[PDB]
Structure formats: C-alpha cells, structure tokens
C-alpha cells in the first residue's frame, strides 16, 4: 500500500513544480532552530541514506572536528545532528512546535503511517540539523545562543536555517554583535536564512484595532528583523485540505462543510444537534443534552461555552464563527469534550436546517475556505522598530497539518508554519540555481534566490476593499514556487539591494524607482503600474485592511539580455491629503507595489513594495499621553467609568497587573497603623497587627474621608495632578515613579527634576531599551511599564532632601529611528515634609458622646484627611474603621462596632487614634486616651 502524500492533495505555494526542477534535497542538509523536538518521528527518514551529505555518524564526526566543534551528535540517518544550545534550562522540553515545523520542512512519512494522507515537506529527502534553543536567562544571551547554532549550521553544511521563532517589536540594533556577525556569516556562505514574521499582529494585539493617530503599529521583532533575512507572514489560501462534516438541507441535497476539530468526534456517526445562542446561560442548553450543541462565537470564552455545554450533558460542540469570511480557531481541549470550529455561513446554514442531525467524515478532502485568499488576522505587521521593511514574503500558515510529538499529526497556524514551507522552497531553488547559474558564487546565488522569490510572488488583493493588502502586512506577496522556478527576471531597488523600496518619509508627489534585471539570452518586453494606497481608517481606529486611492497608467520596458534597466513612477496623491490627513492626523503611509506583466490582460509576473510615510516618521510620539490628561478618563488599554471619569484607583490586593495600564506616575499609601506599626518596630504585620494595607497608587490620587473603595484624581486650578511627596521614610507617599505605555519603541529613558529656578536637581540612571507596550496580556506584554530607575525619593544628587517647593519631574526617551529628537513629557511635583500641627488635648462629653479637640490642625499642604480611626477585634484581627468630624469640629464617638458575622462588640476609648494627613502625606496619629489625658 502506496499513500498518496498531503501535498499530492493540496500544494498551494506550487511546490511540485520547483520539485520537478530541481528535485527533493537527497544530499542537501537543512538546518531548524527551534524549542524542541520528537527525534524519533516516523516523518525522520530518507528514501535513499547513499544520497545523503552524511552516510553515518562517522562522516557527521569528521565535519564536526573540521570545524572544532566539540558538542552535538547524530540521531538517524534523517536528523545528522542535533544539539540543545540551552540545556541550562530547568523547565522541559516543548517538542511540539519544532517538531511541526521540521514536518513542512523536510518530513518524509513512509506509507505504513496511521494517517490518511503521507506528509511530505518540502525537502523530503534532505537531511536535518536539529537545533534546540530557548530562553532561560536573558535575550541577549539567547541571541547569543542562537548565532552559535547558526554558525554551527552553516558551517556543518545547511543550505536553509529556518528559525520559526521570534520576540516581538525588538529592534535587531539590540541584538548583540556576534548575533549580527553569524547572520552576515550565514549570507557570505550563501546560506539561506529565513524567519517567521511573528503572530503579534498589529499594536494591540489580535483582538484590537490601533489608533489612526499613530502609524507605527508594526510589531515584528527578532531574528525577523535583521534585513539579511527572508521574513514570511501568513495568509489563507482559497481552498483548504480539511476535515468535514456532513449535513442534509432543505434541498433534500447533501452538504459537505469544513470542520476544525479539538478531540474526535465518532466518524460516520449520525449525531443530532441543537442550537444553544451564544451558550451564555443554562436556558441555552435546555436541549442539548445527549446531543451536539451548536454555539455562536462571541461575549464569552470558547472554554466557557465548552464547559457550559458538557454542564448540559452536550456530547459534542460546535461553535461558529461571528465574522464573516473568518478563519478556523483552534478550539480549546476543555476535558475532552469534541469540538469544533465552523464558518459563520455554514453555522447558519446549520441554525435554519430542518433536519438537525450532523455527521462527521473519516476522509478529510480539499474544500473552499470561509476566507478565500486573505492575509491571517494573526500575522505580524511591519515596520521593524527601526523603520525596514518587514515582512518580505507571505506563505501558508492557517491550520497546516504536521508532524508532533510522540509520532503524531497535527494542524497548527502560524507564521512558524508558513516559514519552512518558503524555506524549502528557497533550498530547492538555491539547487535548480547550482545548474541553472554555475557561475555564480553561493552568496551571489542566494541574493538571487531571495530577489525571484519576492518578485515573483503574488501581492495578494482584498477583494472587499477593492485595493492590495498592504506590504506592511504582505512584503512581496505570496510565494508561488512555479512562477519563481520559471523566472528569468526579478526587480529590485535602484541600488540593486532588495526587492522592496523603502522611501522613508514623502511629500504627496514623490518618485518610485525600481530596476528591473533580465537573465535571459534575450530582450524582454513588459507592461508596468504601480498601485497608490493608504490604510483604511474606521473612526478612530486603523482598520488593519488597505485603502485605494489610484492606479496609475501601464507603461512599457524592453530590458536588454543580460542586462537591467531602471523606470520611474511619478507618484501625486496631493489631492487625497486633506480627507487622509482628517483621518490620520499625524500623517499616514503612501505606499503600493509596482506590477509586472508580459501584457496588460495577463497574469501579474512579478511584482514590488513600495512604502513611503506622508509626515516625519521619526518623530511621531512615543508615549501614550498620562492618563490624567485624557477628557473622558480613558486610554488605549483602560476604560474609565463614564460616571466617574476621575475615579483612579490603585493596585489593591491584584497579583497581575492588567488593570490601568497607561502613562502616569506612582507612589504608596502607607496607612497610619502600619506606619506605626514599622515604627515601633513589629514584624508581622499583613493580617495580624493590622487590617489596612500598604498599596501602591498613582500619584495625584486621593481617597475620600468616607472611604468608598476609591481614589480619585485632583488637580491644581490649572488641570495638572496634584502629585505631592513627603520624603521623611515613613513608606506614605515618599516618592514618584514612571509608569508609561509606549505606542514606540524608545532609547536612553531618563527622568531629571528641575527647580524651576533653571537648575536640574537631580538625575535618574539610564533605562537604555525600552520596548513598545503592543499588547495588554500577560502571554505577550502589558499595556503599560514601571520602570524603576526613574523612582525620585525627593533628594538632590547629592543626596539630600530638596526643600519645599514645586519641581518639575522631566522624563526624557528618544525613539529608534535614525536622527529622531529627543522626546520628553513633564509633570509638577510638589514636594512638603511639614508635619501637621494638631491637638494635643481634648475633652469629651459623655452625654452625647461628642470629643472637643482644644485647637484644629495647621498644615503646610491642604488637609487630605482628618479623622478619628477606631481599632477593633473582629475574630482576633485588630479591624480599623473611621469616623469623620461634625459640622462644629467635634467627633462624635460610637459605642461599640458591628462584626463581618454580623455581631456586635463594645468600644473602649482606648480604641479611638485621631490621625490628621496632609496632600503630600505627613501624618500625625495620636491616641484618643491621650488627648484627654493632655491636662495638667
Ligand atoms: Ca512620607
Ligand atoms: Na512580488
């Protein structure tokens, strides 16, 4: 028995057609570095190991002490090598991803395979390095980490490094330089590297939108980065080889629908379903017992509508999507319940069919998808952190079946997944390159290679807008490894450097010039355009999907054999400029690609990004505003209560912070009776000597006398917050710190503080890196960063405590762009260490139970709070609860205080402490007993 392969089915990116060229890698080796891998898969083989560049452990031996490389050994004939370059690692080994990525790269399934179809990467028959990295210290020694094993790689042989891997928004300035040495050594070897674009999608994440007032939401990060590089991004296909499900319509007509599922569902058997809404509540499911319930996707978790489901006694879920032309989610594994994941049409489809019965098929078949050729919502957008262009290229990345861990099978999406597809198919055509172009040298062979594939992949086109998805989000286009096999020209920049143009900052008339190169033995003819667009805006939102705003006139090129020849497309969008300008404020992007064609009515032979930015790049605004300049109390990652626009309340008792991520300042509430507490020196505190807590709030905040739970933003008359510190160590309000959620990646972050007499008092030590906050989740990134080395503790640099007055706290970053201006946002920060004078003695009236104070308390800044604190048990816990004073200054004593268990228990003047707070926080705390004992 003779399977037939994966790709027999379904081979979108053409890759037979290169195969038939230049064959399947016998003798190549191709190198994978990765998190981890199943060294034993089946997928591990070779049809003929005499073909092979190493026949036995023995010739892997003698490369490796030809190099001097003393570590790492042979697994089989298939992975050569293996070595884990991060073994210092305590947590285990993930296999999965590398494993998956190995697959599509060079898996060779032998028909004895339990799986219906062979999988058959694109190297089948070429032999692996396998290369284990991870992180376990720092980036910088990861990176470390990883340019050893490149530079291993290439020197063992590999003609391809796939590294499906990545940290997102790092700019490849920060990688260390022997990182950056092993990437050009990789080029001058002429060994290809190729990278995933990462699945950060935009800033914001994959559930958000980024705001139109800043156009530097792109997200990739490192190894992508560096230019030398091949970065592919992923995108769906029109047509998938998925598993299905089968239903009768109306018609009395058998439908057949795509189905992803997580578990198994019994094949061929007939099951019977019931529509559940959103699977929100247990009325939903009034009916889904014993059956599959049909949920729609939306307000809530798919593990929540899982667990709800199985609640019900459902055998089976299936959830459909709420967008329209969508892609399969992974559904979650909640306790092996079968699910899976439908198209919005066909979740409808099934919603109004008559018969509500459903069968799941053994055979999976090549059907159409939702999406029809569409860019993955996933997919990391470019620019770089410092500005390239990134990514070059775009392959399939949505639900690829391949290999995992313990020889199984598996579909996974990602940019992981489209890179070693767009790896093999560099290796392969690096080979058909070995007959085709003798002559060159490996490095030249290779610059080659990474122009074809660029040029001639396809820009993809949204049909919904009518326009091509952005280079930003696509590079190049979709490899097609038949056009790029056929190719015998290719377009590049007019220094011949890359297939892309960046023209960095632009007027709206500008100039695009591209050279077009020609390998043939003859002239070629071709008809050029170049597309002219923008990003579409929804509101205030950038809608992540292309705008048109024109295409210019065909026009034609002969090219000499052997030769090239430059055109130049003028470009003028000056009459778009008011309407973007509305739209995006603080300018946008002017970009394109410029098409190739034998003839107007043919097929796009090659094609080439341009990108350009109508404004200053930059200088576009790296931090997001504080937070106590926004007018309606909300910010990118915080959402005010529209009743209260003012409330900001601190950390509280929270473990992560997820909550109020934006730009502002913090510092500490110390309540009286921890502070006197640390002062009298006890030692176990939390939950024991006292009930209040030490909580880390943002400056410019204060509670109300009557405490409710919150605090809230004040302000001098003129807008600014009120932030005051006290810096006498008593932990209550002692100093600022800068918290800020950057839209831009930034450099040398550095807080000063000026008298505002013309004098810098003192100065921060330097946070060098600072990252972009693209995300609010703790799998990525937070929305916003605390960054310790700005906290100010009120004293001057030379130590000592600056006298009273109002300071300026300066934060200074620059963004990474080459030439940006120094950036810098200000806040008034007043500093008072004048203790509050107060009473010294009272007198109490029994009758009504009212405590006189013998005179009111003077303080240097505004009263914050002045109040009467009584300390109760309540089950061994010393409680504290507070009393505000009367109209006429007196504090009226109650007699006993109420318990959580609803009791009641008595109060002895001995319990009551008067504590009077200023604005910067001095405090005084003063027994109630005392007072009264204040006579002589
Ligand atoms: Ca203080
Ligand atoms: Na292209």
Do not use: C
């Not at 892609?327 to 979650?332: A, G, S, T």
């Not at 503080?753 to 008092?761: A, M, P, Q, R, Y």
């Not at 009393?883 to 008595?906: C, H, K, Q, R, Y």
Request: charged share 25%; net charge negative.
């Amino acid at each position: 028995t003779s399977k037939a392969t994966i790709r027999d089915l379904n081979d979108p990116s053409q890759v037979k057609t290169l195969q038939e060229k230049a064959s399947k890698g016998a003798g190549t080796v191709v190198a994978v570095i990765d998190a981890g891998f199943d060294k034993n898969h089946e997928a591990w083989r070779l049809t003929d190991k005499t073909k092979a560049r190493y026949q036995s452990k023995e010739d892997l031996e003698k490369a490796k002490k030809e190099h001097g490389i003393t570590y790492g050994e042979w697994v089989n004939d298939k992975v050569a090598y293996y070595h884990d370059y991060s073994k210092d690692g305590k947590t285990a080994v993930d296999q999965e991803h590398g494993t998956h990525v190995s697959g599509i790269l060079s898996g060779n399934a032998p028909s004895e395979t339990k799986e219906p179809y062979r999988l058959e990467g694109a190297m089948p028959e070429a032999q692996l390095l396998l290369m284990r990295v991870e992180i376990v210290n720092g980036l910088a020694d990861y990176a470390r980490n990883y340019a050893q094993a490149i530079r291993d790689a290439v020197n063992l042989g590999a003609k391809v490094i796939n590294m499906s891997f990545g940290n997102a928004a790092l700019a490849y300035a920060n990688l260390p330089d022997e990182t950056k040495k092993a990437f050009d050594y990789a080029k001058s070897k002429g060994v290809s590297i190729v990278t995933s674009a990462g699945n950060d999608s935009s800033f914001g994440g994959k559930t958000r939108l980024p705001l139109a007032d800043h156009p530097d939401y792109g997200v990739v990060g490192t190894p992508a980065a560096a230019d030398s590089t091949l970065t592919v991004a992923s995108y769906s296909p029109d047509k998938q080889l998925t598993e299905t499900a089968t239903v009768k319509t109306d018609d009395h007509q058998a439908k057949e629908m795509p189905v992803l599922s997580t578990n198994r569902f019994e094949p061929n058997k007939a099951y019977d379903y019931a529509y559940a809404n959103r699977g929100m509540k247990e009325d939903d499911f009034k009916d889904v017992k014993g059956k599959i319930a049909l949920i729609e996707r939306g307000d809530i978790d798919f593990k929540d509508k899982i667990a709800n489901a199985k609640k019900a006694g459902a055998v089976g879920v299936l959830i459909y999507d709420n967008q329209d032309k969508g892609f399969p989610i992974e559904l979650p594994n909640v306790d092996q319940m079968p699910a899976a994941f439908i198209s919005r049409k066909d979740g409808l489809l099934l919603k109004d069919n008559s018969k509500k019965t459903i069968t799941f098929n053994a055979t999976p078949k090549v059907l159409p998808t939702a999406s029809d050729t569409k860019l993955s919502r996933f997919s990391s957008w470019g620019l770089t952190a410092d500005g390239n262009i990134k990514p070059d290229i775009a392959a399939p990345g949505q639900d690829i079946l391949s290999s995992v861990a313990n020889n199984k099978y598996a579909k996974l999406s990602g940019t992981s997944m489209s890179a070693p597809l767009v790896a093999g198919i560099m290796g392969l055509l690096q080979k058909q390159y070995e007959t085709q172009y003798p002559d060159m040298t490996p490095s030249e062979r290779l610059d080659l290679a990474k122009k074809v594939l660029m040029s001639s992949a396809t820009a993809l086109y949204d049909e919904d807008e009518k326009a091509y998805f952005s280079p930003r989000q696509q590079g190049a286009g979709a490899v097609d490894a038949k056009k790029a096999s056929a190719a015998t020209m290719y377009v590049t920049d007019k220094d011949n450097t890359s297939s892309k143009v960046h023209l960095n900052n632009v007027s709206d008339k500008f100039e695009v010039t591209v050279t077009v190169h020609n390998k043939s033995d003859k002239p070629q003819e071709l008809y050029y355009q170049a597309t002219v667009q923008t990003d579409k805006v929804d509101g205030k939102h950038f809608a992540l999907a292309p705008k048109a705003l024109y295409e210019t006139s065909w026009q034609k090129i002969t090219i000499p054999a052997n030769s090239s020849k430059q055109v130049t497309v003028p470009i003028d969008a000056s009459r778009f400029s008011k309407d973007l300008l509305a739209q995006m404020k603080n300018g946008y992007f002017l970009e394109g690609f410029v098409r190739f064609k034998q003839d107007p009515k043919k097929e796009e032979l090659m094609s080439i990004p341009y990108i350009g930015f109508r404004g200053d790049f930059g200088n576009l605004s790296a931090l997001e505003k504080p937070i106590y300049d926004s007018k309606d109390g909300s910010s990118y990652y915080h959402e005010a209560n529209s009743d209260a626009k003012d409330q900001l309340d601190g950390d509280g008792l929270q473990f992560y912070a997820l909550k109020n991520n934006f730009t502002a300042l913090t510092t500490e509430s110390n309540p009286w009776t921890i502070i006197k507490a640390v002062k009298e020196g006890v030692e176990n505190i939390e939950d024991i000597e006292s009930s209040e807590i030490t909580e880390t709030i943002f400056a410019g905040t204060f509670a109300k006398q009557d405490d409710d739970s919150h605090y809230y933003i004040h302000r001098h008359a003129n807008g600014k917050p009120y932030a005051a510190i006290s810096p006498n160590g008593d932990g209550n309000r002692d100093y600022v710190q800068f918290q800020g959620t950057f839209l831009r990646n930034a450099k040398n972050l550095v807080a000063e503080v000026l008298d505002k007499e013309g004098n810098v008092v003192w100065t921060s030590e330097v946070t060098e890196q600072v990252v972009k906050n693209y995300n609010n989740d703790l799998a990525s990134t937070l929305g916003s960063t605390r960054f310790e080395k700005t906290r100010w503790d009120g004293k001057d640099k030379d130590g000592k405590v600056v006298v009273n007055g109002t300071y300026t706290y300066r934060v200074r970053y620059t963004p990474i762009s080459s030439g940006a201006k120094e950036q810098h946002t200000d806040f008034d920060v007043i500093v008072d260490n004048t203790t509050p004078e107060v009473a010294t003695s009272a007198t109490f009236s029994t009758e009504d139970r009212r405590l006189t104070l013998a005179s009111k308390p003077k303080t240097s800044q505004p009263i914050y709070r002045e109040r009467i604190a009584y300390t109760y048990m309540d089950e061994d816990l010393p409680t504290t609860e507070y009393i505000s004073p009367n109209e006429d200054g007196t504090f009226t004593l109650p007699e006993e205080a109420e318990t959580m268990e609803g009791g009641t228990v008595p109060l002895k003047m001995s319990d009551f402490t008067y504590v009077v707070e200023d604005m910067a926080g001095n405090i005084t705390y003063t027994p109630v007993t005392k007072l009264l004992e204040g006579h002589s």
